[PDB]
Amino acid sequence: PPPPPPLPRRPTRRLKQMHWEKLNSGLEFTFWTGPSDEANKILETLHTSGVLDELDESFAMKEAKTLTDYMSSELQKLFGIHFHKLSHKNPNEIIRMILHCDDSMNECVEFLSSDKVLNQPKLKADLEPYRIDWANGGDLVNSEKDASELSRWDYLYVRLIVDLGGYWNQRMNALKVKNIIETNYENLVRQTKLIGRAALELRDSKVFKGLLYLILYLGNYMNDYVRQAKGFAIGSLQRLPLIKNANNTKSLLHILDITIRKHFPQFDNFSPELSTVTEAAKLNIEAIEQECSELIRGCQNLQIDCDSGALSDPTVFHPDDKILSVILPWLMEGTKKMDFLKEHLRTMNTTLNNAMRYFGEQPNDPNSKNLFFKRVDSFIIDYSKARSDNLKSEE
Amino acid sequence: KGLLYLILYLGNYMNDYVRQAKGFAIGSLQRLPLIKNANNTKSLLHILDI
Amino acid sequence: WXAXCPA
Amino acid sequence: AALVVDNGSGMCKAGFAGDDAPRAVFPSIVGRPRHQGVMVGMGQKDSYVGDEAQSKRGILTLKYPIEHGIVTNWDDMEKIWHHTFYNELRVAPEEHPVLLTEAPLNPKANREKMTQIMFETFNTPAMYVAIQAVLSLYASGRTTGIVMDSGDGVTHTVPIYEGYALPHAILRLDLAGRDLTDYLMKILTERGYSFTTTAEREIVRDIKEKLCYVALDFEQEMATAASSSSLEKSYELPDGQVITIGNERFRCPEALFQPSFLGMESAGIHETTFNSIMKCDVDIRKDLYANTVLSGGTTMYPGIADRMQKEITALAPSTMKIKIIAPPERKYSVWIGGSILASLSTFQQMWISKQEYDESGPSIVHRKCF
Amino acid sequence: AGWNAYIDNLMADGTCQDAAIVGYKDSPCVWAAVPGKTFVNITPAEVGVLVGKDRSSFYVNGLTLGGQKCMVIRDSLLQDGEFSMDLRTKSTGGAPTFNVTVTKTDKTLVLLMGKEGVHGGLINKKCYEMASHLRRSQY
Ligand SMILES: Nc1ncnc2c1ncn2[C@@H]1O[C@H](COP(=O)(O)OP(=O)(O)O)[C@@H](O)[C@H]1O
Ligand SMILES: [Mg+2]
């Protein structure tokens, strides 16, 4: 590398500063360089005119009126954002209501549940001497370590994160699972009922069976003798729009609409008859199954925690900590919810499966398990546009 | 040019010693209206006309 | 008009 | 106590740091009488702004100082601020720092222009300027996401990330509330109601705020609207006249999703939301979809949240999940987020002082508060 | 004198954990950097991306700087007045991310990435200052 360069008349009172952009580069070619006597007489005129004196009186500025935190600079920003509702309350007041697991801070508890607040090794060492050994004795680890010297948010972090960190992650788990279950069990039962009903309706629909037989019988007519199969999969229904006649005006499915209407009045309109399939095509089977399966894993993980985990020990619990007094009442009812959902989960799986073999496809292919109603729905809309175009053109 | 020389001398007396430049761009005229007196009644341009 | 002017 | 002042195209919001609601919420209008005064001795003012201007709007020529985000008149803009501090808030600015907001992709011309008029006319001790879009998700309690910012003047889509704006990813769409109000009147004349002047422009603004709503399916709703009179509602004009609209309730708000109804080549916010997120990085794209937020008074229409959720879902890949966050308080989210930001203890670090400005000049704002 | 002494000047306040200087003319190479850190491993190919004519490709998936993945915030290197760049490191599994700034001089590129929790504005203002000083020295 090349050698490096060195390292880095007047008014009686201060008045308003008028800033400017200066001259571009220098006054190499500007008229400012020219010291015309026209400008010289201006300087003597102003020194004689009573203008500068008035300037001191009128444009004097109004003076200026300008007016041990271990916690990281970024983090004070985050704490004030979420606990804004409690600004008027002292740290002793806000440290108490949070342990009540009240409804008023079901949102703020999620913020302290983030990895950002927990993953702060340097502060945990700094606030460690200020921690109170609440697990045994309930006394300060060091001698004096006054907590009044700490700032407003410093008191909260040491008394909540450092002090209760032994069961903090366990307690938040009991509360994070608390919120998710309270709102999803109602909808999850609705989703699994629709899929099971849709699968049963498709399996128990003669209209859907009848059109497939008509397509198969028509399909075997134009096909060769060596390829006269007696069955086909649902995914093969997409070849109909891809076949065009001599002038490309009318596709294969377009003949079917007028053929059915003229001779098969029973198959004229099957979309109103089978509607739950279309709504079932807007839901992901694997995603729904995984979402429900997540609930059971959290529930069984909770049972070993409340009965034999960190929650089991009450000695490390503060007397004003009703977390044990709130989870246990739900513990019996929560077991009922997981049993019902488990039954519904099994109900959907078998109800989808018996209708799954019934049409020749298998769930072993993950796409086939997911994209089962989509292919049927794809044919439903394809038949809909084919009928609409056929009616519009002829009428 | 006389107008430009007039305001520059006023500004040089008006400003600090460390920023006593001898020239400015034409686009610098825009801060005359936005500088007011104690009661905001008159500006540098208003007193300039007098 | 109905709401506005005379028409 | 630090003032938090929210200048807006339609509404101006002001209050104090830590407060949960703006103290003064008044229209951002300036009025000048178009008729000579014959009754002397009243001390009638020369210019009228805010609620008082709205009260006597019939004999005034209302003007919006800010149009399409850019301030078209710097002389009126201070007057509403002058009325903001001494009249509405009744507080002297000489002893309180003040907070103002700035618009995405703002030209550099304005940014010192507000700076050069506050430290001089009102000589506020301290100042800070941030994006209204950034403060939107701050009130929502999140730091990373994309905001569906729509208001009276302009609309912006800002995919924020740790509170730091992405300039290249900012998309600007000219489909604002004033456009819809202008679109509401041109379609309201079909029913024999002719509103043309600016004073009655507020009237239709009142009508759409109460009666207009977002329909889930346009094609289904026009068929039902033509068939039945159930969707029709009656509104009362201040003169006592009774009006009824049949299908305009869902037609005017629909232009936000079908700009070709207004004739703009740029498409609706539903794709613009999708268009903006295409510009970001692939790895971060997962977070942005699930923390989409709505903001501004334009997004107040009933049934607007599910309609946009349905449309972008088709645009989005089937693998991805979309979570439209629409807090009911998002009307004042920009103001509330600023009060949250001002109340922070660390917020004293990036103050710009009156002294420091003096040696640094107007140019300090581009580098100090960015 | 002593290209390493700037790194010491860069680390006086302790707000940053990595700092480096690289000459982007001819064959890119590091002139001084913090040993054992991110900035000491800069390749010429990464320098070419930073100073390349294409100012849009690094928006699709970010770029790598010393092999560490980072995302682009704002690009103003080739614009007169600032000659500065802003980056934020990209991490996996909730690993800490840091703000990265790069300032372009006549012959050198000054790179700063701060410690955890440090605002990018503080990192940017310093790198602009030493870059401003360094250009006044005709480098
Ligand atoms: N309930 C409502 N329904 C429909 N539009 C509304 C409603 N409330 C407010 N608005 C519209 O929102 C606008 C307010 O814009 P605003 O968000 O204050 O702009 P800015 O973000 O620039 O301050 C008004 O012009 C009004 O037309
Ligand atoms: Mg807005």
PDB file of all heavy atoms in Angstrom, chain A residues 1-8 73-74 115 120 122, chain E residues 1-3 5-6 9 31 94 117 130 133 137 139:
ATOM      1  N   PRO A   1       0.811  -1.221   0.000  1.00  0.00           N
ATOM      2  CA  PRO A   1       0.000   0.000   0.000  1.00  0.00           C
ATOM      3  C   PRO A   1       0.846   1.273   0.000  1.00  0.00           C
ATOM      4  O   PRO A   1       1.953   1.269   0.536  1.00  0.00           O
ATOM      5  CB  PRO A   1      -0.806  -0.119   1.295  1.00  0.00           C
ATOM      6  CG  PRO A   1       0.051  -0.932   2.195  1.00  0.00           C
ATOM      7  CD  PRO A   1       0.829  -1.879   1.318  1.00  0.00           C
ATOM      8  N   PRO A   2       0.326   2.342  -0.596  1.00  0.00           N
ATOM      9  CA  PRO A   2       1.060   3.612  -0.632  1.00  0.00           C
ATOM     10  C   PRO A   2       1.155   4.225   0.753  1.00  0.00           C
ATOM     11  O   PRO A   2       0.406   3.836   1.663  1.00  0.00           O
ATOM     12  CB  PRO A   2       0.211   4.481  -1.574  1.00  0.00           C
ATOM     13  CG  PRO A   2      -1.154   3.903  -1.482  1.00  0.00           C
ATOM     14  CD  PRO A   2      -0.955   2.424  -1.316  1.00  0.00           C
ATOM     15  N   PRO A   3       2.074   5.168   0.962  1.00  0.00           N
ATOM     16  CA  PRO A   3       2.212   5.768   2.284  1.00  0.00           C
ATOM     17  C   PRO A   3       0.935   6.474   2.693  1.00  0.00           C
ATOM     18  O   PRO A   3       0.239   7.076   1.854  1.00  0.00           O
ATOM     19  CB  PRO A   3       3.374   6.756   2.105  1.00  0.00           C
ATOM     20  CG  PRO A   3       3.409   7.040   0.644  1.00  0.00           C
ATOM     21  CD  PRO A   3       3.015   5.754  -0.009  1.00  0.00           C
ATOM     22  N   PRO A   4       0.588   6.426   3.975  1.00  0.00           N
ATOM     23  CA  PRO A   4      -0.680   7.000   4.429  1.00  0.00           C
ATOM     24  C   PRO A   4      -0.523   8.451   4.846  1.00  0.00           C
ATOM     25  O   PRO A   4       0.552   8.866   5.306  1.00  0.00           O
ATOM     26  CB  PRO A   4      -1.064   6.113   5.624  1.00  0.00           C
ATOM     27  CG  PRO A   4       0.109   5.180   5.862  1.00  0.00           C
ATOM     28  CD  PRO A   4       1.253   5.652   5.030  1.00  0.00           C
ATOM     29  N   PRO A   5      -1.576   9.251   4.700  1.00  0.00           N
ATOM     30  CA  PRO A   5      -1.515  10.661   5.105  1.00  0.00           C
ATOM     31  C   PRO A   5      -1.641  10.804   6.611  1.00  0.00           C
ATOM     32  O   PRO A   5      -1.908   9.819   7.316  1.00  0.00           O
ATOM     33  CB  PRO A   5      -2.719  11.276   4.379  1.00  0.00           C
ATOM     34  CG  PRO A   5      -3.695  10.156   4.292  1.00  0.00           C
ATOM     35  CD  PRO A   5      -2.872   8.908   4.087  1.00  0.00           C
ATOM     36  N   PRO A   6      -1.435  12.006   7.150  1.00  0.00           N
ATOM     37  CA  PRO A   6      -1.604  12.199   8.597  1.00  0.00           C
ATOM     38  C   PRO A   6      -3.042  11.972   9.042  1.00  0.00           C
ATOM     39  O   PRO A   6      -3.992  12.192   8.287  1.00  0.00           O
ATOM     40  CB  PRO A   6      -1.174  13.655   8.812  1.00  0.00           C
ATOM     41  CG  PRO A   6      -0.264  13.947   7.670  1.00  0.00           C
ATOM     42  CD  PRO A   6      -0.837  13.191   6.510  1.00  0.00           C
ATOM     43  N   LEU A   7      -3.189  11.520  10.287  1.00  0.00           N
ATOM     44  CA  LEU A   7      -4.498  11.326  10.887  1.00  0.00           C
ATOM     45  C   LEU A   7      -5.171  12.675  11.143  1.00  0.00           C
ATOM     46  O   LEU A   7      -4.498  13.703  11.248  1.00  0.00           O
ATOM     47  CB  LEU A   7      -4.363  10.549  12.196  1.00  0.00           C
ATOM     48  CG  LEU A   7      -4.429   9.021  12.134  1.00  0.00           C
ATOM     49  CD1 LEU A   7      -3.848   8.417  13.400  1.00  0.00           C
ATOM     50  CD2 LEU A   7      -5.857   8.548  11.933  1.00  0.00           C
ATOM     51  N   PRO A   8      -6.514  12.699  11.234  1.00  0.00           N
ATOM     52  CA  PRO A   8      -7.236  13.937  11.558  1.00  0.00           C
ATOM     53  C   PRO A   8      -6.787  14.563  12.877  1.00  0.00           C
ATOM     54  O   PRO A   8      -6.472  13.823  13.810  1.00  0.00           O
ATOM     55  CB  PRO A   8      -8.695  13.482  11.656  1.00  0.00           C
ATOM     56  CG  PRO A   8      -8.770  12.251  10.843  1.00  0.00           C
ATOM     57  CD  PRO A   8      -7.432  11.585  10.941  1.00  0.00           C
ATOM     58  N   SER A  73     -28.151   0.704  24.360  1.00  0.00           N
ATOM     59  CA  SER A  73     -28.797   1.904  23.835  1.00  0.00           C
ATOM     60  C   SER A  73     -30.033   1.563  23.012  1.00  0.00           C
ATOM     61  O   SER A  73     -31.055   2.255  23.095  1.00  0.00           O
ATOM     62  CB  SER A  73     -27.801   2.706  22.998  1.00  0.00           C
ATOM     63  OG  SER A  73     -27.251   1.912  21.961  1.00  0.00           O
ATOM     64  N   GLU A  74     -29.957   0.505  22.204  1.00  0.00           N
ATOM     65  CA  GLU A  74     -31.079   0.146  21.344  1.00  0.00           C
ATOM     66  C   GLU A  74     -32.284  -0.307  22.162  1.00  0.00           C
ATOM     67  O   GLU A  74     -33.432  -0.002  21.816  1.00  0.00           O
ATOM     68  CB  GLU A  74     -30.648  -0.946  20.364  1.00  0.00           C
ATOM     69  CG  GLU A  74     -31.786  -1.688  19.681  1.00  0.00           C
ATOM     70  CD  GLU A  74     -32.756  -0.753  18.984  1.00  0.00           C
ATOM     71  OE1 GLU A  74     -32.291   0.163  18.273  1.00  0.00           O
ATOM     72  OE2 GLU A  74     -33.981  -0.933  19.147  1.00  0.00           O
ATOM     73  N   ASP A 115     -36.819 -13.177  21.168  1.00  0.00           N
ATOM     74  CA  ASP A 115     -35.420 -13.548  21.348  1.00  0.00           C
ATOM     75  C   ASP A 115     -34.544 -12.331  21.619  1.00  0.00           C
ATOM     76  O   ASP A 115     -33.500 -12.455  22.270  1.00  0.00           O
ATOM     77  CB  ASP A 115     -34.914 -14.301  20.117  1.00  0.00           C
ATOM     78  CG  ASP A 115     -34.844 -13.423  18.880  1.00  0.00           C
ATOM     79  OD1 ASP A 115     -35.593 -12.426  18.809  1.00  0.00           O
ATOM     80  OD2 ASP A 115     -34.037 -13.730  17.978  1.00  0.00           O
ATOM     81  N   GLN A 120     -29.417 -11.443  25.497  1.00  0.00           N
ATOM     82  CA  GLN A 120     -28.579 -10.302  25.863  1.00  0.00           C
ATOM     83  C   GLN A 120     -27.581 -10.760  26.920  1.00  0.00           C
ATOM     84  O   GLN A 120     -27.740 -10.477  28.114  1.00  0.00           O
ATOM     85  CB  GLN A 120     -29.428  -9.130  26.357  1.00  0.00           C
ATOM     86  CG  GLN A 120     -28.635  -7.871  26.646  1.00  0.00           C
ATOM     87  CD  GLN A 120     -28.031  -7.265  25.397  1.00  0.00           C
ATOM     88  OE1 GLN A 120     -28.672  -7.211  24.348  1.00  0.00           O
ATOM     89  NE2 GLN A 120     -26.789  -6.805  25.502  1.00  0.00           N
ATOM     90  N   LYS A 122     -24.556  -9.838  27.706  1.00  0.00           N
ATOM     91  CA  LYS A 122     -23.727  -8.852  28.394  1.00  0.00           C
ATOM     92  C   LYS A 122     -24.484  -8.188  29.540  1.00  0.00           C
ATOM     93  O   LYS A 122     -23.923  -7.988  30.624  1.00  0.00           O
ATOM     94  CB  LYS A 122     -23.212  -7.813  27.395  1.00  0.00           C
ATOM     95  CG  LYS A 122     -22.597  -6.572  28.024  1.00  0.00           C
ATOM     96  CD  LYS A 122     -23.467  -5.346  27.813  1.00  0.00           C
ATOM     97  CE  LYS A 122     -22.738  -4.077  28.220  1.00  0.00           C
ATOM     98  NZ  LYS A 122     -23.395  -2.861  27.665  1.00  0.00           N
TER      99      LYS A 122
ATOM    100  N   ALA E   1       0.526   8.125   7.908  1.00  0.00           N
ATOM    101  CA  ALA E   1       1.524   7.173   8.379  1.00  0.00           C
ATOM    102  C   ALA E   1       0.864   6.028   9.137  1.00  0.00           C
ATOM    103  O   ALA E   1      -0.077   6.244   9.903  1.00  0.00           O
ATOM    104  CB  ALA E   1       2.550   7.870   9.257  1.00  0.00           C
ATOM    105  N   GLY E   2       1.359   4.809   8.925  1.00  0.00           N
ATOM    106  CA  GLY E   2       0.845   3.665   9.651  1.00  0.00           C
ATOM    107  C   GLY E   2      -0.614   3.358   9.387  1.00  0.00           C
ATOM    108  O   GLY E   2      -1.458   3.612  10.250  1.00  0.00           O
ATOM    109  N   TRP E   3      -0.930   2.846   8.192  1.00  0.00           N
ATOM    110  CA  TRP E   3      -2.301   2.534   7.791  1.00  0.00           C
ATOM    111  C   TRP E   3      -3.091   1.839   8.898  1.00  0.00           C
ATOM    112  O   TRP E   3      -4.311   2.007   8.996  1.00  0.00           O
ATOM    113  CB  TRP E   3      -2.313   1.648   6.541  1.00  0.00           C
ATOM    114  CG  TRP E   3      -2.092   2.364   5.232  1.00  0.00           C
ATOM    115  CD1 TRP E   3      -1.120   2.096   4.314  1.00  0.00           C
ATOM    116  CD2 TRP E   3      -2.853   3.459   4.700  1.00  0.00           C
ATOM    117  NE1 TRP E   3      -1.229   2.949   3.244  1.00  0.00           N
ATOM    118  CE2 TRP E   3      -2.283   3.797   3.457  1.00  0.00           C
ATOM    119  CE3 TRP E   3      -3.952   4.193   5.157  1.00  0.00           C
ATOM    120  CZ2 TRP E   3      -2.778   4.831   2.665  1.00  0.00           C
ATOM    121  CZ3 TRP E   3      -4.446   5.214   4.366  1.00  0.00           C
ATOM    122  CH2 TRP E   3      -3.857   5.525   3.135  1.00  0.00           C
ATOM    123  N   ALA E   5      -2.850   2.544  12.020  1.00  0.00           N
ATOM    124  CA  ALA E   5      -3.215   3.522  13.042  1.00  0.00           C
ATOM    125  C   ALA E   5      -4.612   4.082  12.817  1.00  0.00           C
ATOM    126  O   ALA E   5      -5.288   4.464  13.779  1.00  0.00           O
ATOM    127  CB  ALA E   5      -2.190   4.656  13.085  1.00  0.00           C
ATOM    128  N   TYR E   6      -5.060   4.152  11.561  1.00  0.00           N
ATOM    129  CA  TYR E   6      -6.437   4.550  11.297  1.00  0.00           C
ATOM    130  C   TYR E   6      -7.417   3.564  11.914  1.00  0.00           C
ATOM    131  O   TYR E   6      -8.424   3.969  12.506  1.00  0.00           O
ATOM    132  CB  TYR E   6      -6.676   4.684   9.793  1.00  0.00           C
ATOM    133  CG  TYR E   6      -5.686   5.586   9.094  1.00  0.00           C
ATOM    134  CD1 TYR E   6      -4.457   5.108   8.669  1.00  0.00           C
ATOM    135  CD2 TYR E   6      -5.989   6.919   8.852  1.00  0.00           C
ATOM    136  CE1 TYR E   6      -3.553   5.931   8.034  1.00  0.00           C
ATOM    137  CE2 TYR E   6      -5.093   7.750   8.215  1.00  0.00           C
ATOM    138  CZ  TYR E   6      -3.877   7.249   7.807  1.00  0.00           C
ATOM    139  OH  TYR E   6      -2.983   8.070   7.171  1.00  0.00           O
ATOM    140  N   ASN E   9      -7.632   4.509  15.268  1.00  0.00           N
ATOM    141  CA  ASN E   9      -8.512   5.673  15.316  1.00  0.00           C
ATOM    142  C   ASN E   9      -9.963   5.257  15.110  1.00  0.00           C
ATOM    143  O   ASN E   9     -10.878   5.817  15.724  1.00  0.00           O
ATOM    144  CB  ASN E   9      -8.083   6.697  14.264  1.00  0.00           C
ATOM    145  CG  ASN E   9      -8.802   8.023  14.411  1.00  0.00           C
ATOM    146  OD1 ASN E   9      -9.908   8.201  13.900  1.00  0.00           O
ATOM    147  ND2 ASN E   9      -8.174   8.965  15.104  1.00  0.00           N
ATOM    148  N   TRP E  31      -5.467  -2.771   3.050  1.00  0.00           N
ATOM    149  CA  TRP E  31      -4.267  -2.085   3.513  1.00  0.00           C
ATOM    150  C   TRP E  31      -4.134  -2.171   5.028  1.00  0.00           C
ATOM    151  O   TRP E  31      -3.018  -2.229   5.556  1.00  0.00           O
ATOM    152  CB  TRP E  31      -4.289  -0.624   3.058  1.00  0.00           C
ATOM    153  CG  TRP E  31      -4.295  -0.454   1.566  1.00  0.00           C
ATOM    154  CD1 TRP E  31      -4.266  -1.443   0.624  1.00  0.00           C
ATOM    155  CD2 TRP E  31      -4.345   0.783   0.845  1.00  0.00           C
ATOM    156  NE1 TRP E  31      -4.291  -0.898  -0.635  1.00  0.00           N
ATOM    157  CE2 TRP E  31      -4.339   0.466  -0.528  1.00  0.00           C
ATOM    158  CE3 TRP E  31      -4.391   2.126   1.227  1.00  0.00           C
ATOM    159  CZ2 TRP E  31      -4.378   1.444  -1.519  1.00  0.00           C
ATOM    160  CZ3 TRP E  31      -4.427   3.094   0.242  1.00  0.00           C
ATOM    161  CH2 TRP E  31      -4.424   2.749  -1.114  1.00  0.00           C
ATOM    162  N   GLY E  94     -31.927 -16.372  14.166  1.00  0.00           N
ATOM    163  CA  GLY E  94     -31.994 -15.286  15.123  1.00  0.00           C
ATOM    164  C   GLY E  94     -30.642 -14.824  15.625  1.00  0.00           C
ATOM    165  O   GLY E  94     -30.528 -14.324  16.748  1.00  0.00           O
ATOM    166  N   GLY E 117     -26.692  -3.543  18.687  1.00  0.00           N
ATOM    167  CA  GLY E 117     -27.517  -2.480  19.217  1.00  0.00           C
ATOM    168  C   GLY E 117     -27.105  -1.078  18.830  1.00  0.00           C
ATOM    169  O   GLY E 117     -27.677  -0.116  19.360  1.00  0.00           O
ATOM    170  N   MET E 130     -14.150  10.453   8.466  1.00  0.00           N
ATOM    171  CA  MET E 130     -12.796  10.057   8.092  1.00  0.00           C
ATOM    172  C   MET E 130     -12.639   9.980   6.578  1.00  0.00           C
ATOM    173  O   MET E 130     -11.558  10.261   6.048  1.00  0.00           O
ATOM    174  CB  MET E 130     -12.410   8.735   8.758  1.00  0.00           C
ATOM    175  CG  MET E 130     -12.039   8.868  10.240  1.00  0.00           C
ATOM    176  SD  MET E 130     -13.378   9.158  11.412  1.00  0.00           S
ATOM    177  CE  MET E 130     -14.121   7.532  11.463  1.00  0.00           C
ATOM    178  N   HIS E 133     -12.091  13.556   5.633  1.00  0.00           N
ATOM    179  CA  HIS E 133     -10.706  13.922   5.914  1.00  0.00           C
ATOM    180  C   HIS E 133      -9.758  13.306   4.894  1.00  0.00           C
ATOM    181  O   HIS E 133      -8.826  13.962   4.417  1.00  0.00           O
ATOM    182  CB  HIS E 133     -10.323  13.476   7.324  1.00  0.00           C
ATOM    183  CG  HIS E 133      -8.866  13.172   7.480  1.00  0.00           C
ATOM    184  ND1 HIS E 133      -7.905  14.157   7.565  1.00  0.00           N
ATOM    185  CD2 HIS E 133      -8.202  11.994   7.538  1.00  0.00           C
ATOM    186  CE1 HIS E 133      -6.714  13.597   7.685  1.00  0.00           C
ATOM    187  NE2 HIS E 133      -6.867  12.286   7.672  1.00  0.00           N
ATOM    188  N   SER E 137      -6.930  14.773   1.857  1.00  0.00           N
ATOM    189  CA  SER E 137      -5.522  14.415   1.769  1.00  0.00           C
ATOM    190  C   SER E 137      -5.154  13.851   0.401  1.00  0.00           C
ATOM    191  O   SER E 137      -4.068  13.282   0.244  1.00  0.00           O
ATOM    192  CB  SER E 137      -5.163  13.416   2.869  1.00  0.00           C
ATOM    193  OG  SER E 137      -5.317  13.995   4.154  1.00  0.00           O
ATOM    194  N   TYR E 139      -6.394  11.253  -1.267  1.00  0.00           N
ATOM    195  CA  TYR E 139      -6.374   9.798  -1.339  1.00  0.00           C
ATOM    196  C   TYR E 139      -7.784   9.268  -1.574  1.00  0.00           C
ATOM    197  O   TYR E 139      -7.988   8.080  -1.815  1.00  0.00           O
ATOM    198  CB  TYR E 139      -5.787   9.192  -0.061  1.00  0.00           C
ATOM    199  CG  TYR E 139      -4.282   9.069  -0.056  1.00  0.00           C
ATOM    200  CD1 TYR E 139      -3.474  10.174   0.179  1.00  0.00           C
ATOM    201  CD2 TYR E 139      -3.668   7.844  -0.280  1.00  0.00           C
ATOM    202  CE1 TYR E 139      -2.098  10.062   0.187  1.00  0.00           C
ATOM    203  CE2 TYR E 139      -2.294   7.722  -0.274  1.00  0.00           C
ATOM    204  CZ  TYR E 139      -1.512   8.834  -0.040  1.00  0.00           C
ATOM    205  OH  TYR E 139      -0.142   8.715  -0.033  1.00  0.00           O
TER     206      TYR E 139
END
